[PDB]
Amino acid sequence: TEEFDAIKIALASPDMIRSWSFGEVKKPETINYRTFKPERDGLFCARIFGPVKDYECLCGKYKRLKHRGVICEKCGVEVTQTKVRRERMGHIELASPTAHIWFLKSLPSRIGLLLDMPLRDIERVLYFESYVVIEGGMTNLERQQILTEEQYLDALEEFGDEFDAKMGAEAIQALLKSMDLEQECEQLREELNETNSETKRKKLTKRIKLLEAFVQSGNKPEWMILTVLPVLPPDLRPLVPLDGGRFATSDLNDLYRRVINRNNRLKRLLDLAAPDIIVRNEKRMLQEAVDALLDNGRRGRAITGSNKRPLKSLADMIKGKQGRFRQNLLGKRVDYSGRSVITVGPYLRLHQCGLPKKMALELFKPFIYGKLELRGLATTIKAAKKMVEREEAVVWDILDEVIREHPVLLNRAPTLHRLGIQAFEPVLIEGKAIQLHPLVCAAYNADFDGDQMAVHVPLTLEAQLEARALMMSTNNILSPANGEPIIVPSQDVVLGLYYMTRDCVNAKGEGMVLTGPKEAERLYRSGLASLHARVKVRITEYEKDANGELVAKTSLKDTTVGRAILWMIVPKGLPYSIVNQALGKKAISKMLNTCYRILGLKPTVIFADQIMYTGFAYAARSGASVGIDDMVIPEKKHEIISEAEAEVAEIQEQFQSGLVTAGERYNKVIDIWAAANDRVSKAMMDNLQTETVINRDGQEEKQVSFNSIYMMADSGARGSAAQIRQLAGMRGLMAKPDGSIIETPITANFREGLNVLQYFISTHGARKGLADTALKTANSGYLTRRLVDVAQDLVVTEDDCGTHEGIMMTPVIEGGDVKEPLRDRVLGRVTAEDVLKPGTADILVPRNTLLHEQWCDLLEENSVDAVKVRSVVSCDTDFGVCAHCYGRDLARGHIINKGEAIGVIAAQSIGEPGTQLTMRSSIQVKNKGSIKLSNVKSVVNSSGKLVITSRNTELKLIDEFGRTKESYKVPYGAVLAKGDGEQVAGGETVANWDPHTMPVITEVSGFVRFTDMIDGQTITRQTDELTGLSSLVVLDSAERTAGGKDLRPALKIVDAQGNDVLIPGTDMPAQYFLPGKAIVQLEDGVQISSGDTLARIPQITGGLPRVADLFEARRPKEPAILAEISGIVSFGKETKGKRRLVITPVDGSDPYEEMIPKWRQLNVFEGERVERGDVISDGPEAPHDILRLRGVHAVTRYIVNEVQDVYRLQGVKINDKHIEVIVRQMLRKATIVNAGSSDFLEGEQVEYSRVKIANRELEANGKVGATYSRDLLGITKASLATESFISAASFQETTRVLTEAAVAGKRDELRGLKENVIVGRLIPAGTGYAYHQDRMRRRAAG
């Protein structure tokens, strides 16, 4: 229509709004009830808003279009269409101004901070409680002075008419119109440069920028106080009839009426010369009425109606989940849709869904009209309608003709991830249930216990082409969350295949030879041999040769009849070995995956369908079933339980003799019950799992049992070892609601009856779990909404940015366990640098190569330990990411195509598993390797051991090929029994430490001499009359005297002559201070060896909250402090609770001082040389400081590691890319440290793209570029921080962002996805992307 390019917002000038309005409304009247006609000058006055009916005058003067576009003479109504009623806005004119409640009440008082006034004063003047002052030079009274009534009278009775004092509305209007902007701008900036206080500086800066925003928008600030108030058109605030002729009035109409009434009252009291207090009361009521109209409930008590409910003001029509933004602009209701209960249909091919005939007829009724007239069977739409409503079977023939290639979309609420909507080619069935193919039903997360599903039909041919090419289920084989296929069988299919491939030691026809799988099928179907019988069969297989031909091979192999039968369906090219074992769920999954990699898409689809058919058929023929005799109870159980209860009695009587504390008695009982439960479980599994049967020759032999429940568990079709354990073994301990474990475990299994007590205590867990999931759903949905909002802008916009930067990928290893191999972390990513063959300079993998499966296998063969890959966070693309930095698209297998929206994919991929999350002294070598130290400094002693002065060293055990095997952190001062590079074996002790104390280490031998210490002041003389030998303890600051304050207890080391030995490498003396409350085992004046120690020192949350805190950039409550500077630590002044630490740079001239608290244990002893980003004290880690110290790569590695850790603990797989993209989206805001020659002001928040572009052009013309630091804002703030104010207003805090944009004079270019979705043009992603490129070229041409 109007083809707008952007949207602009600003304050409303009163002349502008008056120009909008086609008239003023002056009375609270709406419509007459004798005749349902609007009253003139009323809220629905037709003379203003136009006629109620098309071209119908209120007077009845004219009735048809012959006079279209003329006014009546008897009345001012116009001969036009009713649509104008929707458009035209009225206006009302107030006898007094009124503050617009938004600018007052918004969290920063924009008017208040503009005028520097406290909000209490502003409300006390605007609400008519006090006067305020405007000054004249003859009076000492200054302007903006608050003035109470007694002060008002006191001032006026001496200086009346010399100064002036007014109430809130008029005074604020006059003040705003009586101030200049440039003078206050310059005074504010001069104060900013002259002042120092950071609070004062930030207030000054925000005022400066507010004034700059007002001047650059040119919006006269006084406009913030309304003087003329718009009237919403009648249709948007409809008055709707009711039964009995009543009418429901929209609350907006009542608020408007009240405001009209108050305005009329105030004008009448003014024009008849009322006394002062009366008109003041009336105008205060009018101001309150306007506040109610705009934002009822925003201040004080909310207005309410007869229903005792608060009325919904205008602001409530846009705020909240019922608001206009969320309810209608997004999430429209749609035509051509249906819903129905779903149902299994196994006879369907993969790509076709069974759609009830009635729904098809209803949906395609327009298409049927069309084709029926086209084929000449019906002449007019009435004929078509009457024919289709009579269902003349020719309509059924036409209906079968129309849909033959017409895909439809199936959707299941909630649409957790994009698989939730899929496309199918319909097939017509009588009945009323929609029939799905079970395989895709598994992907839907759907079930068949009564889940409904909704169906939409695309209209246009471009739309149906999109549905076919993109959405058809034959395309969505690979999940976006990971590369593994999503179309995977379960339940009966897996059970059937498992039964079909399981062999037994002796069966009908064992040992015969079959010339081909067809004969195997014959012998099975003719009943002369059972599936399980082992036999030799001649089989042909094929392989993809070096050229790409399917070269054949034929041979005899040992197999089972069932296995040959299954092989017969396998397509050419897969090796026979894939089948020749007991096929579980995982085996079938990897079989489908290997089919998809070796062959194309369509052979895999056909293979899937054939698998489904054969599995179902043979499962049915199997007749597997569950019976009460199957859940065998191991007869050992009674004995084990008697033993356990005997031990319980023993420990209980041991406590009865008082030999132990009750807590340890509880612990012992719990331990023995757990041990007994495990023993019973093992006995049950052993008895169930295997059984003895006679062989062919007549002897007993063991084999895997065909017990039904065991077969179901072992196949992986359904159930688990836990459920089997509960079914037959004793189910064990259970927790009280506090999470503590009841001493008496539930002893009876499910097969025997549970007593009432066991059942009752068990119900605790059941209701805990149900409440748990009920609550978790909401948090998961909320989190997903957030992630989507933050990442929705990001789209692949170019092929290659040309960045050599990237991140280093190594396998994730914790505590000697390889939690994640390198192949998974690097598959599908592009090499940032050329990979070299280990130990050589030869290039193994070139730079900028997408690492597919063959490259990963090659990397594994050469045992490459680390790779460097391109990352989303390191991409140089502006307003997007390049295809090479993102890498392989999980859903397709190759490099991602241009124009794909990746952020939304990542957001859904993170959100969906969230439904599954839960929410309420020595080192031993594990295996062979070599010991290496990551970062260490070590000293060796007379005992032959090694003691370490690095506080964050890690042992790493390395493979003979240089790959890592194990790694473990080692505390300060631990003792080590081995040198670096020595060989190690499993179970070998290599290092030791006391975890219950902190030592202090002396590197060189010598004679200790106490220094800077006095007994009873810095140290006190412990003689442990109750414990043992003499000792000395440093007196804490509360215990030490003032003489012990500046004297810091220490010991120097001296030579044999008593001369103070120097540190071996520095000019500092070998001086070792004793921290507060430190303990030393040695007295003054004793010898100590090199590498020897003397010091004694006194020394979890749920997954979903943890991930929420990570992505919200939450500051941890005990932030570890790290060295902001490279230098030497140094002590200094002391004060209450906090120590004045200082770091002194080695070469730098700028020391820094920090208020390090003393209650946290310090890891610094006045000798620790330290570098930037090194830990000074431990604790939870603050992401912002990590970013400041160690850069973007450190923080991205930290975030990805934590999120992957929690998810892998749950067992869900999510590729790192979807976390890295979120991290890059978090990282937009930067701050300017110097402007160079740029126009940017210092300390401003700027989007990283803008400053990057500005610096690039600035250096492109040779000027000094600006410098910046990047700030990790939380995802909520980062989503609100965007320039696209429309998206922000859609998301949260609508009033705040609207006010901010309004005062700013913001403009949004409508470049993201959400904005275009609101507007309704094509999104700039996917197929729409191309449409935009031409447009932008035209916009470049324009």
Binding site: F4, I17, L236, P238, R324, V334, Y336, A463, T1327
Partner: protein, 99 residues
């Protein structure tokens, strides 16, 4: 339940909700994100503008479908005009640019 076409609401001009009113299903925001995950722009545009809210575009679409031509002409969602009128009535001036 199934709805090809029927009644339309007064204020928002969107189709009615619920079986009793013979309304259509709701293409909730989660489904919109699902479409955004695909490159399927055209079906999204059709879902929002023509099928739902364009007071004239859906008439044109009905005409063309009856005629057997699967054209499309996206106008402007009337709910957007409703939002504009409410924001203006609030006293905040908002307007389109580059007409």
């Amino acid at each position: 339940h199934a709805r090809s076409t029927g009644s339309y609401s007064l204020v928002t001009q969107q189709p009615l909700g619920g079986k009793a009113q013979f309304g259509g299903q709701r293409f909730g925001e989660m489904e919109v994100w699902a479409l955004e995950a695909y490159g399927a722009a055209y079906t999204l545009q059709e879902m929002l503008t023509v099928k739902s809210d364009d007071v004239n575009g859906r008439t044109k679409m009905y005409k063309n479908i009856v005629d057997g031509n699967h054209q499309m002409e996206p106008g402007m969602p009337e709910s957007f005009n409703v939002l504009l009128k409410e924001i203006r009535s609030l006293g905040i001036n908002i307007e389109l640019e580059d007409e």
